[PDB]
Amino acid sequence: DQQLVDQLSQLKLNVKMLDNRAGENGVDCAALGADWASCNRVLFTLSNDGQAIDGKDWVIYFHSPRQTLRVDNDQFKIAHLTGDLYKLEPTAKFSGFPAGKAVEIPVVAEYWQLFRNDFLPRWYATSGDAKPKMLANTDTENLDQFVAPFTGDQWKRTKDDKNILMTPASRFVSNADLQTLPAGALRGKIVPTPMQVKVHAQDADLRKGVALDLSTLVKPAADVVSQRFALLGVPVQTNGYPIKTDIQPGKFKGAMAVSGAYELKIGKKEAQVIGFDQAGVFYGLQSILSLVPSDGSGKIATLDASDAPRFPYRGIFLDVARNFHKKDAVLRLLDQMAAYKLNKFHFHLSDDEGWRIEIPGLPELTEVGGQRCHDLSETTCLLPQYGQGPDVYGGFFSRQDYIDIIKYAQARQIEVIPEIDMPAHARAAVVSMEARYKKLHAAGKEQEANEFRLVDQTDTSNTTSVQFFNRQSYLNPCLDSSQRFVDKVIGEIAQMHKEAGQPIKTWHFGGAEAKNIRLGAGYTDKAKPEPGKGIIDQSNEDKPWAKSQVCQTMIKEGKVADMEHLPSYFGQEVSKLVKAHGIDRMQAWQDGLKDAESSKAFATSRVGVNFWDTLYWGGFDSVNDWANKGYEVVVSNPDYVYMDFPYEVNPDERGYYWGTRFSDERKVFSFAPDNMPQNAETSVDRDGNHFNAKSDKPWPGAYGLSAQLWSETQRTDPQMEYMIFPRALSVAERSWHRAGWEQDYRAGREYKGGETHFVDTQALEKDWLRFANILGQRELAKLDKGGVAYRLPVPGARVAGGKLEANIALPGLGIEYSTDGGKQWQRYDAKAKPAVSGEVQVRSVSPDGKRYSRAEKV
Amino acid sequence: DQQLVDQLSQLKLNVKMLDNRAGENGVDCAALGADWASCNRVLFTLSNDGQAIDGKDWVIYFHSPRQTLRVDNDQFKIAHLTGDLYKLEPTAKFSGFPAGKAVEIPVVAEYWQLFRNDFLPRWYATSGDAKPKMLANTDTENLDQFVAPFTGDQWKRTKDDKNILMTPASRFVSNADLQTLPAGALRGKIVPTPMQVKVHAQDADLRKGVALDLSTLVKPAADVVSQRFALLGVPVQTNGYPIKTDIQPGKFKGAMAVSGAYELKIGKKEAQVIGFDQAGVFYGLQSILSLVPSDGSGKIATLDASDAPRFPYRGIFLDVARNFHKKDAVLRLLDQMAAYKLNKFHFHLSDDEGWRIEIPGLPELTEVGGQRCHDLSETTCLLPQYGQGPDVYGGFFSRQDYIDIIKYAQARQIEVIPEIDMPAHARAAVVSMEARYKKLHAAGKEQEANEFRLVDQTDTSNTTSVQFFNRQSYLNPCLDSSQRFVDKVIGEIAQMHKEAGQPIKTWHFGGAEAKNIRLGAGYTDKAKPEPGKGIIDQSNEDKPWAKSQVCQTMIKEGKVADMEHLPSYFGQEVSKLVKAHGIDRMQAWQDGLKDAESSKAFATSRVGVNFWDTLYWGGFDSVNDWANKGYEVVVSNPDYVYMDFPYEVNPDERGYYWGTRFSDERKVFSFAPDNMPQNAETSVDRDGNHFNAKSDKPWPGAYGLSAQLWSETQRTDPQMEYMIFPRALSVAERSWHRAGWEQDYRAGREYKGGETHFVDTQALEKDWLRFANILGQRELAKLDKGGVAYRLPVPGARVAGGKLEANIALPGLGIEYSTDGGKQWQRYDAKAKPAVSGEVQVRSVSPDGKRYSRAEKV
Ligand SMILES: CC(=O)N[C@@H]1[C@@H](O)[C@H](O[C@@H]2O[C@H](CO)[C@@H](O)[C@H](O)[C@H]2NC(C)=O)[C@@H](CO)O[C@H]1O
Ligand SMILES: CC(=O)N[C@@H]1[C@@H](O)[C@H](O[C@@H]2O[C@H](CO)[C@@H](O)[C@H](O)[C@H]2NC(C)=O)[C@@H](CO)O[C@H]1O
């Protein structure tokens, strides 16, 4: 009853990693069904400061990105619901949570959990008809309340992991090659770096305002510029320092004759921006804005520049489906994107755990798909996921909200690319359409109920997606109703784009991995075990839709060759619908198009691919084939531009890490997207090891670059901003500028990490030093003004001769230190290092002095 | 002597624009007498690869649409003869064209010359009794032989010109909103769009021929249909797919009860056409024909349609006077007109530089008026004009040729409307009648000599027409002999119409601007200069006929109020003669009727007006008054339907451009003729700027739409066809169909370009996309079969990711590209874009693969 839920809600949870490499230390992970025989042991401790909890009629629900394989306290048992949702229950041996006692429940989980952020908050208790209530100490974003610190080598994935744990001591080394440059050494440095620029000794003076001739821009775009001068402290007045604008395409030739190109002259009494087009004028103005200093001095260098995109597609991807992000955060994101010339906003509006766009005619997509709550019947919500608690959690963009975002993006030269995943990663749609089916069927409106249904009633397939959902994660690609659904959705969103003044150019249909993970290579069948693989019963595992009778008949009539080809087939069909709706470009994650012959297989005249192989797994060679088959490659490599991954290897950092252990501003910046093999000399793999890379194939070139904020653990808007910024500035730099150290691709050139010296690292490090300093001494202050909760890097620090030496990943940022265990903080001055003894802590401070990085012991 | 002419003929001319905005860069254009103080500087270079040319007894004649105001090489001087004819001569300082030297002669000309087509070919040399010989490198239609390319911003009319120069790069953008539609998306699409239509899933099969029941049509009309099925590859056999026809007016009601209306049913085994009248049956058959595909498949969609004219008058105007166009080209034009339901052929048979209709009794009109040759005495020819060389150039339709054309038009439901200009634009008649006078006077037949004379012997008026002719361009409206001439001409042409079986319904008397341009607002008098105007001596400038003593006496007796009213008076008098000849409708360009009280002032029961004001000069408001005064408005706006203007803003394109800088298929199609103000949201003005439009007056509606091919620079038949087609298809569409995006006119509604959003642009663009695709994938192939040398649009192209992306104004057309500077050409395939580096050129190809657009560098 409710009293039982009450008692359980007051149990205090503690989560403690015991062994991240349990298979290396005896546990038979293979027998437990762990992928590649890899598993970890964790201790869940439930402490009871109240009276005995002896009731047996209860379930405790919790979330985890890892499956639970074994429970080592025989009073309890754990089962999986679907996705990340699990349940802990008493067994027949349960004898209660004794008064004033801590109950230990050791468990084994698949893989490893290398960051504390793996452990999700908001466990909750239930009991016959009572209402669900969270275990209170878990109702928080502060992991310290319920997750013990990692100790020793618990951060290591394997005994041979070569990654470097970051602490003040090791981080000092990681930063040592850097230094703070004098303001005089950073004059006329536009970000992103301009193609050609000549800075002159003198500075224009903008302190008395500027006179802006913005007649070349449509009003909304002009307003964006005017407002940014004001945000940056530069008055806009008719008697200010002139800034003239003009548009003349003919003035541009060759590679410079492209949208966004401009010519810029900053003189000591006036300024001039000549654009290839409106975007070019706009970017020319952003460059002037990038020079505005953070000291309010208003002085910028006189200079002469010519500038143009290396790539037409400079993207930022944002997942609002796993966890929602409010309209105001999207707008802030779009503001910074404009500031750094990123022009493409790839909007991941649906996935298995949420559907975030209102669709006229299909209310259930947002009424049910737009929220998660504990309703085991998923009639009013999707099941809870991602540690947001058992109560209703969610949100979605109204039709007006969405039109508003498109207008906002467009004023800023950013194109909105809507992504609606299918056939995989569609659980929100499927479950919502099942609720619609059920509701309309109840009223006896069977044709209306079946109009948009995404389930084949006959399908009993047994498949598991990458996030551990079942067949409901997959929309059925063989139903006429599924095509009615896709048509309806494209139709509705395209109309919003037309009303917002930016007709869709590209439709992104997802195309994520649509396979049953239980048939993957790391699992083995129980009949005949092969060592080192997770032993499971594969005799009832199917391929997606294998038991769908509609698909079976579709194959039989000759529409599709077999079940394996359904995903490919579905992508060709979506392309027809995209085209039928007047959209002539389609885009997808690579898996959704791999089985296609080439780009000629699609109805649209252009097909883009979000290339997401890692390099250490051969992505430096598989990328080629995509361009050579006629697809436009949007470089989206997870080992460099997945912004849901950690900034640094430290178990207190946020992020998933399946593709690599960390990607900091420096790493993102060091990535050479158009000569993938060269990255072997400038980066290490997921385990910190050197790798080699070479391709013998032709490489026509990449179409664009895109960085991704997936949102599994970015539960709040602040967390989203911490993960995106400031590394998205590095993304903008590389997306816009081809550096000298980025070599032309050479078929047959083999780069060997730690062995070959083809790459001009001297030039790379100098470029990075200057960029880091621009971020530290100037741009982060602008991010402050923008209201984005960017990540402040923790200092690097060491004690030598009894004094503190500190350094930072983004030189220019203030560093503070504390000798009293963090009670009182003092400014660190490099040219007057402090004498210290005993425990010392360090932290960095934002330019406006209001925010701090986390603090760490030296 | 002849040796001198020989030497000069071998000089090689080069024409190079130096400054199209000379007045903005210091030249005092006002002082030079330039209209509105606007002038341009051009370099004429004469290169001599032979021995020295030191003779002084020579004149070099050349043509230009602009007057020469100054010569900046004091060895030479230039004078104007009349019209476009000028002469370059040595001065007393001339010291010869040195051997192996290029002589530079910079000149200043009035206005601007924005297209290379402004410069006319066939300069020629003369010298005492020798025979005239052209400078050989100028004897060509290929401007590249003697006119340098334009560079930089030489295409701009003013420093603020906002037009967009079209190059592959900018044209790609201009075309980007378009795409190629799948054949399946273009089923049952009749052109022009039918009023009501319902397409069904199935296709009739015409590959085995059709069985045509054409008993509803008179033989000649039936033959036209039979032949078109054959041209389009559809056999006509008694055992083919039936196509029945019937005429029943009663079957039509309301707006649909009009000539040309029909009902059409296309079934899978037979077809049915029910016409309001013969024209309606004929149009019903053209609609079936419009559906015949270009793949020879013979498949057309089953459908049910109701269709009728929005306007009774759907005109194509053709000038054969400035430059002649052969009977075969007129016939081809009439063929295409029938195909697209255009039913009115406005035949501009006379003007100042030619008279093209044989008139029994007045042989001099064609013997002298029908040819131009270098005879300074204009006894056997009119003076040379329009760069056709010094030898005899011309032609004219015999009485039989003309009767033949009328018969041909009539079989095709097209009415021939003859235009004989007067009182202005009559130099051919005046000079021919002066030669008749002189000849008959020589024989002592003074009454015969004076019978048809168009000159008052006493008239010493000093006036200048728009094309820079003097008083001989104006027939004298006060002479009895002039009325004898007009009566004779109407009498003779009306009889041809009766013999051809199509009695004239409308007589068009021209009524072009009959004023002395030297008294216009842009000129000022030298006594008292006002700034910004061309300074001239206006003390000897008169109004037309001011010095005619016959007119002075006509005014004195009370027949006409003053000289200013002579043109108005003459139009009332012509109306009496038109009526006396049994013609009950008269038509004119607006200026010829503006001074009239209203339509009640004319003898005919109907008076039409070719409305030709531009919209940005207030035509959206002045049009109203014409209908409200009882005239039938034939919309002929030069800013949209003057087909002598350029398809696109590029200095290598052909066309005059005084009313607007370009009118492409899209623009013609976007024109809303019956709600003129709405064009403010869908077009820009002559300088590429937005304009506003609103009328508060009543607007009963337009009578018709007419597109005009004036022929100053359309020197050949091919050029005539390039200028008419394919934009005349857009003309036919709009002349026949009122689109949904064409709003009802609303008094007081102010459309503001770039500000108001009243017009459904979404619907306009979708309509245009479909139309463009119909032209590209189907109709242009028919134009090929028709033998018309239509204009092929140059591709739009860009390079991204190192691959070529190309697009086209008329989707469906093949695109080719060259990477070897145009030596070898390859087909462009959108779904397999080519990897390119360095210089790339693009061109489009006609559906039959035999013709190409001009090529341009990407
Ligand atoms: C717990 C964990 O790390 N699971 C991995 C998945 O996150 C990952 O899925 C891909 O990466 C994104 C997270 O970075 C996912 O949000 C997204 O669904 C998916 N990306 C695409 C394009 O499908 C998969 C990749 O195989 O690996 C898991 O182990
Ligand atoms: C060189 C030039 O552009 N001159 C213009 C004249 O062509 C133009 O005359 C009108 O336009 C037609 C050409 O489009 C002429 O052939 C025709 O004589 C005349 N049309 C009518 C109905 O009279 C005049 C218009 O004012 O402008 C000149 O600048």
mmCIF file of N, CA and C and ligand atoms in Angstrom, chain B residues 65-66 322 425 466-467 512-513 589 612 642 644-645 656 658 710 712, ligand 2:
data_model
loop_
_atom_site.group_PDB
_atom_site.id
_atom_site.type_symbol
_atom_site.label_atom_id
_atom_site.label_comp_id
_atom_site.label_asym_id
_atom_site.label_seq_id
_atom_site.Cartn_x
_atom_site.Cartn_y
_atom_site.Cartn_z
ATOM 1 N N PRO B 65 21.564 52.416 -82.037
ATOM 2 C CA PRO B 65 20.317 52.819 -81.446
ATOM 3 C C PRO B 65 20.499 54.034 -80.520
ATOM 4 N N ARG B 66 21.754 54.420 -80.340
ATOM 5 C CA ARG B 66 22.087 55.582 -79.491
ATOM 6 C C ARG B 66 22.744 56.663 -80.340
ATOM 7 N N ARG B 322 10.499 46.537 -89.119
ATOM 8 C CA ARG B 322 11.905 46.950 -88.818
ATOM 9 C C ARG B 322 12.874 46.039 -89.558
ATOM 10 N N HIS B 425 5.424 56.996 -87.171
ATOM 11 C CA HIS B 425 5.973 55.698 -87.627
ATOM 12 C C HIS B 425 5.504 55.371 -89.038
ATOM 13 N N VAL B 466 11.050 59.247 -81.689
ATOM 14 C CA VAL B 466 11.759 58.421 -80.701
ATOM 15 C C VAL B 466 12.945 57.670 -81.303
ATOM 16 N N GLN B 467 12.899 57.358 -82.603
ATOM 17 C CA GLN B 467 14.033 56.628 -83.227
ATOM 18 C C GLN B 467 14.952 57.551 -83.983
ATOM 19 N N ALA B 512 1.157 55.392 -82.428
ATOM 20 C CA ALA B 512 2.325 55.459 -81.528
ATOM 21 C C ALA B 512 2.566 56.933 -81.170
ATOM 22 N N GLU B 513 3.452 57.180 -80.230
ATOM 23 C CA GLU B 513 3.788 58.512 -79.760
ATOM 24 C C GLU B 513 4.184 59.497 -80.848
ATOM 25 N N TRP B 589 -2.270 51.762 -80.252
ATOM 26 C CA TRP B 589 -1.443 51.843 -79.013
ATOM 27 C C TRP B 589 -2.030 53.045 -78.250
ATOM 28 N N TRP B 612 0.185 49.943 -72.951
ATOM 29 C CA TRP B 612 1.636 49.638 -72.838
ATOM 30 C C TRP B 612 2.399 50.483 -71.857
ATOM 31 N N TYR B 642 6.732 42.224 -73.583
ATOM 32 C CA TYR B 642 7.481 42.646 -74.782
ATOM 33 C C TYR B 642 8.569 41.570 -74.980
ATOM 34 N N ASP B 644 10.697 41.409 -77.321
ATOM 35 C CA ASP B 644 11.935 41.916 -77.911
ATOM 36 C C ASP B 644 12.921 42.239 -76.779
ATOM 37 N N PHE B 645 12.514 42.026 -75.525
ATOM 38 C CA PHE B 645 13.385 42.270 -74.363
ATOM 39 C C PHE B 645 14.091 40.974 -73.968
ATOM 40 N N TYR B 656 16.116 44.540 -76.781
ATOM 41 C CA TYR B 656 16.008 45.913 -76.268
ATOM 42 C C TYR B 656 15.589 45.762 -74.801
ATOM 43 N N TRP B 658 14.266 48.890 -72.743
ATOM 44 C CA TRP B 658 13.855 50.203 -72.218
ATOM 45 C C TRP B 658 12.767 50.069 -71.170
ATOM 46 N N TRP B 710 8.794 43.015 -81.257
ATOM 47 C CA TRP B 710 9.276 44.151 -82.054
ATOM 48 C C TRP B 710 10.592 43.645 -82.690
ATOM 49 N N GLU B 712 13.657 45.401 -84.103
ATOM 50 C CA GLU B 712 14.914 46.141 -84.337
ATOM 51 C C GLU B 712 16.158 45.270 -84.413
HETATM 52 C C1 LIG C 2 16.639 52.068 -78.145
HETATM 53 C C2 LIG C 2 15.363 51.952 -77.414
HETATM 54 O O1 LIG C 2 15.202 51.178 -76.563
HETATM 55 N N1 LIG C 2 14.404 52.861 -77.805
HETATM 56 C C3 LIG C 2 13.060 52.818 -77.173
HETATM 57 C C4 LIG C 2 12.021 52.463 -78.234
HETATM 58 O O2 LIG C 2 12.335 51.168 -78.706
HETATM 59 C C5 LIG C 2 10.618 52.493 -77.593
HETATM 60 O O3 LIG C 2 9.629 52.441 -78.647
HETATM 61 C C6 LIG C 2 8.574 51.540 -78.406
HETATM 62 O O4 LIG C 2 9.028 50.224 -78.111
HETATM 63 C C7 LIG C 2 9.237 49.334 -79.209
HETATM 64 C C8 LIG C 2 10.494 48.544 -78.841
HETATM 65 O O5 LIG C 2 10.208 47.777 -77.698
HETATM 66 C C9 LIG C 2 9.436 50.123 -80.491
HETATM 67 O O6 LIG C 2 9.771 49.202 -81.556
HETATM 68 C C10 LIG C 2 8.132 50.878 -80.831
HETATM 69 O O7 LIG C 2 8.420 51.843 -81.848
HETATM 70 C C11 LIG C 2 7.659 51.600 -79.595
HETATM 71 N N2 LIG C 2 6.326 51.027 -79.192
HETATM 72 C C12 LIG C 2 5.213 51.739 -79.421
HETATM 73 C C13 LIG C 2 3.935 51.097 -78.998
HETATM 74 O O8 LIG C 2 5.249 52.793 -79.888
HETATM 75 C C14 LIG C 2 10.391 53.814 -76.845
HETATM 76 C C15 LIG C 2 9.120 53.823 -75.972
HETATM 77 O O9 LIG C 2 8.960 55.152 -75.453
HETATM 78 O O10 LIG C 2 11.422 53.985 -75.902
HETATM 79 C C16 LIG C 2 12.732 54.142 -76.507
HETATM 80 O O11 LIG C 2 13.642 54.625 -75.539
#
